[PDB]
mmCIF file of N, CA and C in Angstrom:
data_model
loop_
_atom_site.group_PDB
_atom_site.id
_atom_site.type_symbol
_atom_site.label_atom_id
_atom_site.label_comp_id
_atom_site.label_asym_id
_atom_site.label_seq_id
_atom_site.Cartn_x
_atom_site.Cartn_y
_atom_site.Cartn_z
ATOM 1 N N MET A 1350 46.501 0.848 -18.888
ATOM 2 C CA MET A 1350 46.136 1.522 -20.132
ATOM 3 C C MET A 1350 44.641 1.369 -20.406
ATOM 4 N N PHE A 1351 44.093 2.150 -21.337
ATOM 5 C CA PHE A 1351 42.674 2.024 -21.670
ATOM 6 C C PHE A 1351 42.439 1.629 -23.111
ATOM 7 N N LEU A 1352 41.712 0.545 -23.313
ATOM 8 C CA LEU A 1352 41.435 0.091 -24.664
ATOM 9 C C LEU A 1352 40.053 0.471 -25.150
ATOM 10 N N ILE A 1353 39.229 1.024 -24.279
ATOM 11 C CA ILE A 1353 37.814 0.990 -24.593
ATOM 12 C C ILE A 1353 36.983 2.029 -23.851
ATOM 13 N N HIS A 1354 35.820 2.362 -24.389
ATOM 14 C CA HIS A 1354 34.919 3.238 -23.664
ATOM 15 C C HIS A 1354 33.540 2.603 -23.625
ATOM 16 N N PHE A 1355 32.954 2.473 -22.441
ATOM 17 C CA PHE A 1355 31.687 1.756 -22.350
ATOM 18 C C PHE A 1355 30.623 2.439 -21.493
ATOM 19 N N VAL A 1356 29.400 1.935 -21.616
ATOM 20 C CA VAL A 1356 28.212 2.623 -21.115
ATOM 21 C C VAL A 1356 27.547 2.183 -19.786
ATOM 22 N N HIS A 1357 28.141 1.273 -19.019
ATOM 23 C CA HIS A 1357 27.657 1.021 -17.648
ATOM 24 C C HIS A 1357 26.230 0.505 -17.501
ATOM 25 N N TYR A 1358 26.029 -0.776 -17.755
ATOM 26 C CA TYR A 1358 24.758 -1.405 -17.436
ATOM 27 C C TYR A 1358 24.699 -1.734 -15.951
ATOM 28 N N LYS A 1359 23.503 -1.694 -15.375
ATOM 29 C CA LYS A 1359 23.284 -2.146 -14.002
ATOM 30 C C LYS A 1359 21.893 -2.753 -13.929
ATOM 31 N N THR A 1360 21.688 -3.799 -13.131
ATOM 32 C CA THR A 1360 20.326 -4.317 -12.975
ATOM 33 C C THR A 1360 19.733 -3.858 -11.640
ATOM 34 N N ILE A 1361 18.809 -2.898 -11.701
ATOM 35 C CA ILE A 1361 18.307 -2.205 -10.506
ATOM 36 C C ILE A 1361 17.013 -2.846 -10.009
ATOM 37 N N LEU A 1362 16.643 -3.949 -10.645
ATOM 38 C CA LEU A 1362 15.340 -4.552 -10.420
ATOM 39 C C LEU A 1362 15.072 -4.897 -8.944
ATOM 40 N N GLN A 1363 13.931 -4.395 -8.468
ATOM 41 C CA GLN A 1363 13.487 -4.473 -7.072
ATOM 42 C C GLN A 1363 12.687 -5.727 -6.768
ATOM 43 N N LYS A 1364 12.655 -6.686 -7.688
ATOM 44 C CA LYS A 1364 11.527 -7.611 -7.822
ATOM 45 C C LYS A 1364 10.980 -8.192 -6.510
ATOM 46 N N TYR A 1365 11.788 -8.188 -5.456
ATOM 47 C CA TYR A 1365 11.322 -8.618 -4.138
ATOM 48 C C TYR A 1365 10.906 -7.448 -3.230
ATOM 49 N N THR A 1366 9.880 -7.656 -2.409
ATOM 50 C CA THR A 1366 9.455 -6.613 -1.482
ATOM 51 C C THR A 1366 9.379 -7.116 -0.039
ATOM 52 N N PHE A 1367 10.232 -6.550 0.814
ATOM 53 C CA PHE A 1367 10.207 -6.831 2.244
ATOM 54 C C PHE A 1367 9.929 -5.587 3.059
ATOM 55 N N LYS A 1368 8.719 -5.474 3.586
ATOM 56 C CA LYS A 1368 8.354 -4.361 4.452
ATOM 57 C C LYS A 1368 8.049 -4.925 5.825
ATOM 58 N N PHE A 1369 8.704 -4.407 6.848
ATOM 59 C CA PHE A 1369 8.425 -4.892 8.184
ATOM 60 C C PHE A 1369 7.855 -3.789 9.051
ATOM 61 N N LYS A 1370 6.722 -4.082 9.680
ATOM 62 C CA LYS A 1370 6.047 -3.115 10.530
ATOM 63 C C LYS A 1370 6.983 -2.639 11.636
ATOM 64 N N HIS A 1371 7.016 -1.337 11.901
ATOM 65 C CA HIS A 1371 7.787 -0.868 13.038
ATOM 66 C C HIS A 1371 7.015 -1.243 14.283
ATOM 67 N N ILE A 1372 7.690 -1.277 15.432
ATOM 68 C CA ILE A 1372 7.083 -1.829 16.651
ATOM 69 C C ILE A 1372 5.780 -1.125 17.073
ATOM 70 N N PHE A 1373 5.779 0.200 17.005
ATOM 71 C CA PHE A 1373 4.680 1.006 17.535
ATOM 72 C C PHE A 1373 3.326 0.850 16.828
ATOM 73 N N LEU A 1374 3.282 0.087 15.747
ATOM 74 C CA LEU A 1374 1.998 -0.239 15.146
ATOM 75 C C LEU A 1374 1.163 -1.157 16.043
ATOM 76 N N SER A 1375 1.835 -1.980 16.854
ATOM 77 C CA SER A 1375 1.130 -2.942 17.714
ATOM 78 C C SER A 1375 0.976 -2.535 19.188
ATOM 79 N N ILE A 1376 1.460 -1.351 19.552
ATOM 80 C CA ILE A 1376 1.370 -0.869 20.936
ATOM 81 C C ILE A 1376 -0.096 -0.676 21.350
ATOM 82 N N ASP A 1377 -0.379 -0.737 22.650
ATOM 83 C CA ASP A 1377 -1.762 -0.599 23.111
ATOM 84 C C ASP A 1377 -2.218 0.834 23.188
ATOM 85 N N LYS A 1378 -3.529 0.993 23.106
ATOM 86 C CA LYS A 1378 -4.161 2.235 23.455
ATOM 87 C C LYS A 1378 -5.311 1.911 24.375
ATOM 88 N N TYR A 1379 -5.954 2.929 24.922
ATOM 89 C CA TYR A 1379 -7.131 2.720 25.745
ATOM 90 C C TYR A 1379 -8.378 2.993 24.924
ATOM 91 N N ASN A 1380 -9.187 1.975 24.688
ATOM 92 C CA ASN A 1380 -10.414 2.181 23.941
ATOM 93 C C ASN A 1380 -11.599 2.043 24.849
ATOM 94 N N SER A 1381 -12.693 2.686 24.487
ATOM 95 C CA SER A 1381 -13.827 2.659 25.377
ATOM 96 C C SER A 1381 -15.133 2.451 24.628
ATOM 97 N N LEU A 1382 -16.081 1.751 25.238
ATOM 98 C CA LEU A 1382 -17.458 1.805 24.776
ATOM 99 C C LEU A 1382 -17.984 3.216 24.976
ATOM 100 N N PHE A 1383 -18.864 3.690 24.105
ATOM 101 C CA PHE A 1383 -19.413 5.030 24.298
ATOM 102 C C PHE A 1383 -20.905 5.122 24.087
ATOM 103 N N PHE A 1384 -21.642 5.516 25.120
ATOM 104 C CA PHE A 1384 -23.087 5.713 24.996
ATOM 105 C C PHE A 1384 -23.376 7.176 25.306
ATOM 106 N N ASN A 1385 -24.580 7.636 24.986
ATOM 107 C CA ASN A 1385 -24.973 8.997 25.334
ATOM 108 C C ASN A 1385 -25.322 9.129 26.812
ATOM 109 N N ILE A 1386 -24.671 10.059 27.504
ATOM 110 C CA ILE A 1386 -24.893 10.214 28.937
ATOM 111 C C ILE A 1386 -26.227 10.865 29.192
ATOM 112 N N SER A 1387 -27.137 10.190 29.880
ATOM 113 C CA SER A 1387 -28.405 10.841 30.173
ATOM 114 C C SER A 1387 -28.328 11.696 31.443
ATOM 115 N N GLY A 1388 -27.475 11.340 32.396
ATOM 116 C CA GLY A 1388 -27.355 12.175 33.589
ATOM 117 C C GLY A 1388 -26.083 11.962 34.388
ATOM 118 N N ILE A 1389 -25.824 12.806 35.372
ATOM 119 C CA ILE A 1389 -24.627 12.684 36.203
ATOM 120 C C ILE A 1389 -24.904 13.103 37.641
ATOM 121 N N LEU A 1390 -24.362 12.368 38.596
ATOM 122 C CA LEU A 1390 -24.451 12.785 39.985
ATOM 123 C C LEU A 1390 -23.050 12.895 40.544
ATOM 124 N N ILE A 1391 -22.660 14.051 41.058
ATOM 125 C CA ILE A 1391 -21.380 14.116 41.757
ATOM 126 C C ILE A 1391 -21.577 14.383 43.239
ATOM 127 N N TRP A 1392 -20.761 13.767 44.076
ATOM 128 C CA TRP A 1392 -20.761 14.085 45.490
ATOM 129 C C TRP A 1392 -19.338 14.024 46.020
ATOM 130 N N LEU A 1393 -18.875 15.100 46.651
ATOM 131 C CA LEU A 1393 -17.666 15.015 47.472
ATOM 132 C C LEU A 1393 -17.891 15.675 48.842
ATOM 133 N N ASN A 1394 -17.948 17.002 48.854
ATOM 134 C CA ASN A 1394 -18.402 17.770 50.015
ATOM 135 C C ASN A 1394 -19.920 17.956 50.039
ATOM 136 N N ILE A 1395 -20.459 18.179 48.843
ATOM 137 C CA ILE A 1395 -21.835 18.581 48.633
ATOM 138 C C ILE A 1395 -22.350 17.903 47.370
ATOM 139 N N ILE A 1396 -23.569 17.376 47.399
ATOM 140 C CA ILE A 1396 -24.032 16.645 46.233
ATOM 141 C C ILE A 1396 -24.563 17.598 45.172
ATOM 142 N N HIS A 1397 -24.327 17.245 43.914
ATOM 143 C CA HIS A 1397 -24.771 18.022 42.775
ATOM 144 C C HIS A 1397 -25.313 17.112 41.697
ATOM 145 N N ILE A 1398 -26.485 17.425 41.157
ATOM 146 C CA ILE A 1398 -27.063 16.595 40.104
ATOM 147 C C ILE A 1398 -27.256 17.337 38.811
ATOM 148 N N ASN A 1399 -26.817 16.731 37.727
ATOM 149 C CA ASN A 1399 -27.088 17.264 36.422
ATOM 150 C C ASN A 1399 -27.896 16.265 35.625
ATOM 151 N N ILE A 1400 -28.995 16.713 35.038
ATOM 152 C CA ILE A 1400 -29.794 15.826 34.208
ATOM 153 C C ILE A 1400 -29.891 16.339 32.777
ATOM 154 N N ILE A 1401 -29.252 15.625 31.859
ATOM 155 C CA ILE A 1401 -29.238 16.009 30.453
ATOM 156 C C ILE A 1401 -30.505 15.574 29.736
ATOM 157 N N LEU A 1402 -30.900 14.335 29.978
ATOM 158 C CA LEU A 1402 -32.045 13.741 29.308
ATOM 159 C C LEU A 1402 -32.804 12.860 30.281
ATOM 160 N N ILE A 1403 -34.103 13.077 30.450
ATOM 161 C CA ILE A 1403 -34.827 12.187 31.347
ATOM 162 C C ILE A 1403 -35.484 11.058 30.585
ATOM 163 N N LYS A 1404 -34.958 9.859 30.796
ATOM 164 C CA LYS A 1404 -35.549 8.639 30.271
ATOM 165 C C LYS A 1404 -35.325 7.545 31.291
ATOM 166 N N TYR A 1405 -36.021 6.426 31.120
ATOM 167 C CA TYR A 1405 -35.723 5.270 31.941
ATOM 168 C C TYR A 1405 -34.293 4.827 31.611
ATOM 169 N N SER A 1406 -33.452 4.786 32.640
ATOM 170 C CA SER A 1406 -32.026 4.528 32.470
ATOM 171 C C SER A 1406 -31.744 3.028 32.409
ATOM 172 N N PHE A 1407 -31.129 2.581 31.323
ATOM 173 C CA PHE A 1407 -30.910 1.154 31.141
ATOM 174 C C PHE A 1407 -29.561 0.659 31.673
ATOM 175 N N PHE A 1408 -28.699 1.588 32.076
ATOM 176 C CA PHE A 1408 -27.365 1.238 32.552
ATOM 177 C C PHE A 1408 -26.843 2.274 33.541
ATOM 178 N N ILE A 1409 -26.096 1.868 34.563
ATOM 179 C CA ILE A 1409 -25.590 2.844 35.539
ATOM 180 C C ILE A 1409 -24.163 2.592 36.037
ATOM 181 N N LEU A 1410 -23.308 3.604 35.942
ATOM 182 C CA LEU A 1410 -21.928 3.476 36.408
ATOM 183 C C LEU A 1410 -21.634 4.189 37.709
ATOM 184 N N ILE A 1411 -20.800 3.578 38.536
ATOM 185 C CA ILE A 1411 -20.385 4.216 39.771
ATOM 186 C C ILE A 1411 -18.887 4.197 39.843
ATOM 187 N N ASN A 1412 -18.321 5.324 40.227
ATOM 188 C CA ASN A 1412 -16.899 5.521 40.097
ATOM 189 C C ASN A 1412 -16.452 6.276 41.330
ATOM 190 N N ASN A 1413 -15.530 5.716 42.095
ATOM 191 C CA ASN A 1413 -15.169 6.321 43.385
ATOM 192 C C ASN A 1413 -13.864 7.105 43.527
ATOM 193 N N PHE A 1414 -13.113 7.315 42.453
ATOM 194 C CA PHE A 1414 -11.703 7.601 42.629
ATOM 195 C C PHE A 1414 -11.376 8.872 43.399
ATOM 196 N N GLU A 1415 -11.793 10.048 42.949
ATOM 197 C CA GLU A 1415 -11.570 11.228 43.785
ATOM 198 C C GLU A 1415 -12.843 11.611 44.471
ATOM 199 N N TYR A 1416 -13.789 12.000 43.646
ATOM 200 C CA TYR A 1416 -15.132 12.336 44.039
ATOM 201 C C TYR A 1416 -16.047 11.137 43.739
ATOM 202 N N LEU A 1417 -17.086 10.906 44.533
ATOM 203 C CA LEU A 1417 -18.060 9.894 44.135
ATOM 204 C C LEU A 1417 -18.839 10.379 42.924
ATOM 205 N N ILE A 1418 -18.846 9.622 41.838
ATOM 206 C CA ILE A 1418 -19.614 10.054 40.688
ATOM 207 C C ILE A 1418 -20.445 8.917 40.164
ATOM 208 N N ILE A 1419 -21.648 9.244 39.707
ATOM 209 C CA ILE A 1419 -22.571 8.245 39.182
ATOM 210 C C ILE A 1419 -23.060 8.653 37.801
ATOM 211 N N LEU A 1420 -22.651 7.917 36.770
ATOM 212 C CA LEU A 1420 -22.983 8.304 35.402
ATOM 213 C C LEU A 1420 -24.214 7.492 35.004
ATOM 214 N N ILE A 1421 -25.324 8.193 34.777
ATOM 215 C CA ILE A 1421 -26.639 7.578 34.535
ATOM 216 C C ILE A 1421 -26.934 7.410 33.035
ATOM 217 N N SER A 1422 -27.317 6.178 32.677
ATOM 218 C CA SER A 1422 -27.514 5.694 31.296
ATOM 219 C C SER A 1422 -26.284 5.923 30.424
ATOM 220 N N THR A 1423 -25.118 5.863 31.052
ATOM 221 C CA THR A 1423 -23.915 6.483 30.507
ATOM 222 C C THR A 1423 -23.470 5.911 29.176
ATOM 223 N N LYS B 1433 -9.922 -14.837 -53.480
ATOM 224 C CA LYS B 1433 -9.202 -15.386 -54.620
ATOM 225 C C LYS B 1433 -9.141 -14.358 -55.749
ATOM 226 N N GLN B 1434 -10.270 -13.725 -56.019
ATOM 227 C CA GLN B 1434 -10.367 -12.749 -57.092
ATOM 228 C C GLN B 1434 -9.519 -11.488 -56.823
ATOM 229 N N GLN B 1435 -9.330 -11.160 -55.553
ATOM 230 C CA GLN B 1435 -8.675 -9.912 -55.166
ATOM 231 C C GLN B 1435 -7.192 -10.019 -54.806
ATOM 232 N N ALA B 1436 -6.622 -11.218 -54.819
ATOM 233 C CA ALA B 1436 -5.311 -11.387 -54.201
ATOM 234 C C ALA B 1436 -4.185 -11.103 -55.172
ATOM 235 N N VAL B 1437 -3.124 -10.480 -54.658
ATOM 236 C CA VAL B 1437 -1.935 -10.173 -55.446
ATOM 237 C C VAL B 1437 -0.701 -10.689 -54.745
ATOM 238 N N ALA B 1438 0.120 -11.463 -55.446
ATOM 239 C CA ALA B 1438 1.295 -12.059 -54.814
ATOM 240 C C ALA B 1438 2.603 -11.383 -55.216
ATOM 241 N N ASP B 1439 3.372 -10.992 -54.210
ATOM 242 C CA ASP B 1439 4.761 -10.609 -54.408
ATOM 243 C C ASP B 1439 5.611 -11.846 -54.604
ATOM 244 N N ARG B 1440 6.803 -11.659 -55.147
ATOM 245 C CA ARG B 1440 7.710 -12.771 -55.296
ATOM 246 C C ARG B 1440 8.139 -13.276 -53.933
ATOM 247 N N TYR B 1441 8.294 -12.360 -52.992
ATOM 248 C CA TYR B 1441 8.766 -12.748 -51.681
ATOM 249 C C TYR B 1441 7.823 -13.741 -51.007
ATOM 250 N N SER B 1442 6.519 -13.477 -51.030
ATOM 251 C CA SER B 1442 5.565 -14.356 -50.355
ATOM 252 C C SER B 1442 5.578 -15.745 -50.974
ATOM 253 N N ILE B 1443 6.074 -15.838 -52.203
ATOM 254 C CA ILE B 1443 6.238 -17.127 -52.869
ATOM 255 C C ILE B 1443 7.533 -17.833 -52.470
ATOM 256 N N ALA B 1444 8.623 -17.083 -52.371
ATOM 257 C CA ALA B 1444 9.879 -17.682 -51.940
ATOM 258 C C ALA B 1444 9.772 -18.175 -50.510
ATOM 259 N N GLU B 1445 8.950 -17.506 -49.701
ATOM 260 C CA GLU B 1445 8.741 -17.888 -48.299
ATOM 261 C C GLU B 1445 8.382 -19.351 -48.110
ATOM 262 N N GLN B 1446 7.640 -19.902 -49.058
ATOM 263 C CA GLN B 1446 7.133 -21.255 -48.924
ATOM 264 C C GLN B 1446 8.179 -22.336 -49.180
ATOM 265 N N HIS B 1447 9.003 -22.170 -50.208
ATOM 266 C CA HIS B 1447 10.087 -23.127 -50.405
ATOM 267 C C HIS B 1447 11.387 -22.464 -50.056
ATOM 268 N N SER B 1448 11.877 -22.781 -48.864
ATOM 269 C CA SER B 1448 13.026 -22.104 -48.274
ATOM 270 C C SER B 1448 13.198 -22.573 -46.846
ATOM 271 N N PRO B 1449 14.428 -22.509 -46.331
ATOM 272 C CA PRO B 1449 14.633 -22.851 -44.924
ATOM 273 C C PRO B 1449 14.053 -21.758 -44.042
ATOM 274 N N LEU B 1450 13.718 -22.081 -42.801
ATOM 275 C CA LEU B 1450 13.277 -21.050 -41.869
ATOM 276 C C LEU B 1450 14.472 -20.470 -41.126
ATOM 277 N N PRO B 1451 14.564 -19.134 -41.083
ATOM 278 C CA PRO B 1451 15.698 -18.448 -40.450
ATOM 279 C C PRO B 1451 15.693 -18.603 -38.935
ATOM 280 N N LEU B 1452 16.834 -18.908 -38.333
ATOM 281 C CA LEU B 1452 16.919 -18.950 -36.877
ATOM 282 C C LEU B 1452 17.308 -17.591 -36.353
ATOM 283 N N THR B 1453 17.351 -16.629 -37.255
ATOM 284 C CA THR B 1453 17.902 -15.343 -36.927
ATOM 285 C C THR B 1453 16.908 -14.229 -37.225
ATOM 286 N N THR B 1454 16.455 -13.568 -36.172
ATOM 287 C CA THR B 1454 15.770 -12.300 -36.311
ATOM 288 C C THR B 1454 16.809 -11.278 -36.733
ATOM 289 N N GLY B 1455 16.389 -10.214 -37.401
ATOM 290 C CA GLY B 1455 17.337 -9.222 -37.878
ATOM 291 C C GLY B 1455 17.993 -8.374 -36.807
ATOM 292 N N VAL B 1456 17.681 -8.657 -35.545
ATOM 293 C CA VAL B 1456 18.132 -7.831 -34.435
ATOM 294 C C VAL B 1456 19.632 -7.954 -34.193
ATOM 295 N N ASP B 1457 20.299 -6.810 -34.255
ATOM 296 C CA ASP B 1457 21.741 -6.668 -34.074
ATOM 297 C C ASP B 1457 22.170 -6.839 -32.607
ATOM 298 N N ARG B 1458 23.473 -7.006 -32.363
ATOM 299 C CA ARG B 1458 24.021 -6.920 -31.004
ATOM 300 C C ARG B 1458 23.572 -5.635 -30.296
ATOM 301 N N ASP B 1459 23.817 -4.487 -30.916
ATOM 302 C CA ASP B 1459 23.517 -3.206 -30.290
ATOM 303 C C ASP B 1459 22.030 -3.001 -30.111
ATOM 304 N N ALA B 1460 21.255 -3.439 -31.090
ATOM 305 C CA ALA B 1460 19.810 -3.321 -30.993
ATOM 306 C C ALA B 1460 19.275 -4.096 -29.783
ATOM 307 N N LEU B 1461 19.920 -5.224 -29.482
ATOM 308 C CA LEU B 1461 19.557 -6.084 -28.357
ATOM 309 C C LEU B 1461 20.018 -5.488 -27.037
ATOM 310 N N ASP B 1462 21.180 -4.849 -27.065
ATOM 311 C CA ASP B 1462 21.618 -4.007 -25.959
ATOM 312 C C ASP B 1462 20.519 -2.988 -25.606
ATOM 313 N N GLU B 1463 20.090 -2.188 -26.586
ATOM 314 C CA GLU B 1463 19.064 -1.176 -26.333
ATOM 315 C C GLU B 1463 17.740 -1.785 -25.924
ATOM 316 N N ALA B 1464 17.403 -2.956 -26.450
ATOM 317 C CA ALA B 1464 16.171 -3.618 -26.025
ATOM 318 C C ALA B 1464 16.232 -3.959 -24.538
ATOM 319 N N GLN B 1465 17.358 -4.521 -24.109
ATOM 320 C CA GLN B 1465 17.503 -4.915 -22.716
ATOM 321 C C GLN B 1465 17.465 -3.699 -21.820
ATOM 322 N N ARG B 1466 18.160 -2.644 -22.229
ATOM 323 C CA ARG B 1466 18.161 -1.405 -21.465
ATOM 324 C C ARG B 1466 16.774 -0.773 -21.379
ATOM 325 N N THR B 1467 16.062 -0.720 -22.496
ATOM 326 C CA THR B 1467 14.714 -0.176 -22.494
ATOM 327 C C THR B 1467 13.812 -0.959 -21.549
ATOM 328 N N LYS B 1468 13.763 -2.278 -21.716
ATOM 329 C CA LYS B 1468 12.924 -3.098 -20.849
ATOM 330 C C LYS B 1468 13.264 -2.838 -19.395
ATOM 331 N N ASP B 1469 14.552 -2.840 -19.095
ATOM 332 C CA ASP B 1469 14.987 -2.624 -17.733
ATOM 333 C C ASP B 1469 14.422 -1.302 -17.221
ATOM 334 N N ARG B 1470 14.722 -0.214 -17.921
ATOM 335 C CA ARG B 1470 14.293 1.126 -17.532
ATOM 336 C C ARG B 1470 12.783 1.243 -17.283
ATOM 337 N N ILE B 1471 11.985 0.749 -18.219
ATOM 338 C CA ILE B 1471 10.534 0.824 -18.079
ATOM 339 C C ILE B 1471 10.015 -0.029 -16.928
ATOM 340 N N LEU B 1472 10.560 -1.230 -16.771
ATOM 341 C CA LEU B 1472 10.116 -2.093 -15.686
ATOM 342 C C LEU B 1472 10.416 -1.424 -14.359
ATOM 343 N N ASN B 1473 11.633 -0.908 -14.238
ATOM 344 C CA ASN B 1473 12.063 -0.224 -13.031
ATOM 345 C C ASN B 1473 11.142 0.936 -12.661
ATOM 346 N N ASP B 1474 10.831 1.792 -13.628
ATOM 347 C CA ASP B 1474 9.942 2.910 -13.330
ATOM 348 C C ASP B 1474 8.518 2.482 -13.004
ATOM 349 N N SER B 1475 8.033 1.411 -13.625
ATOM 350 C CA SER B 1475 6.695 0.923 -13.299
ATOM 351 C C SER B 1475 6.631 0.355 -11.871
ATOM 352 N N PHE B 1476 7.648 -0.413 -11.459
ATOM 353 C CA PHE B 1476 7.703 -0.930 -10.078
ATOM 354 C C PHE B 1476 7.825 0.196 -9.059
ATOM 355 N N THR B 1477 8.679 1.173 -9.358
ATOM 356 C CA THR B 1477 8.766 2.380 -8.540
ATOM 357 C C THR B 1477 7.397 3.044 -8.373
ATOM 358 N N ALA B 1478 6.708 3.273 -9.488
ATOM 359 C CA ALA B 1478 5.386 3.899 -9.467
ATOM 360 C C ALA B 1478 4.372 3.134 -8.609
ATOM 361 N N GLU B 1479 4.342 1.812 -8.765
ATOM 362 C CA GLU B 1479 3.420 0.991 -7.983
ATOM 363 C C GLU B 1479 3.725 1.009 -6.476
ATOM 364 N N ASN B 1480 5.001 0.900 -6.121
ATOM 365 C CA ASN B 1480 5.369 1.017 -4.719
ATOM 366 C C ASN B 1480 4.991 2.381 -4.155
ATOM 367 N N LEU B 1481 5.074 3.409 -4.988
ATOM 368 C CA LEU B 1481 4.661 4.742 -4.570
ATOM 369 C C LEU B 1481 3.163 4.863 -4.345
ATOM 370 N N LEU B 1482 2.367 4.106 -5.094
ATOM 371 C CA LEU B 1482 0.931 4.082 -4.812
ATOM 372 C C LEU B 1482 0.657 3.359 -3.513
ATOM 373 N N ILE B 1483 1.385 2.273 -3.259
ATOM 374 C CA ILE B 1483 1.232 1.546 -1.994
ATOM 375 C C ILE B 1483 1.653 2.411 -0.797
#
């Protein structure tokens, strides 16, 4: 039987906060140092030189993977 | 001193017991609790939404 009619209180208080980072926030990426390329030399069958900026080059990279390439002041 | 006017009530206040009872009713206290709850809840919601 029913004796009464009432209004339904509830305590919805969130007072605690637990947020956990999903895994992919910590995954790696590939980051690189970046300087302005002053020049480039490519050689595979035939050598080719491109010069963007002529200055005394303070750093030089050599990379052999497919074609021989030399990145000047890179 | 020159400007003051006393009601009878402010005089009875001095010689008299102190009430342990605010005039707040059962139902009035129900609504107080509900109001506080509702406002607190919406403020926490709002702040989490800014975060």
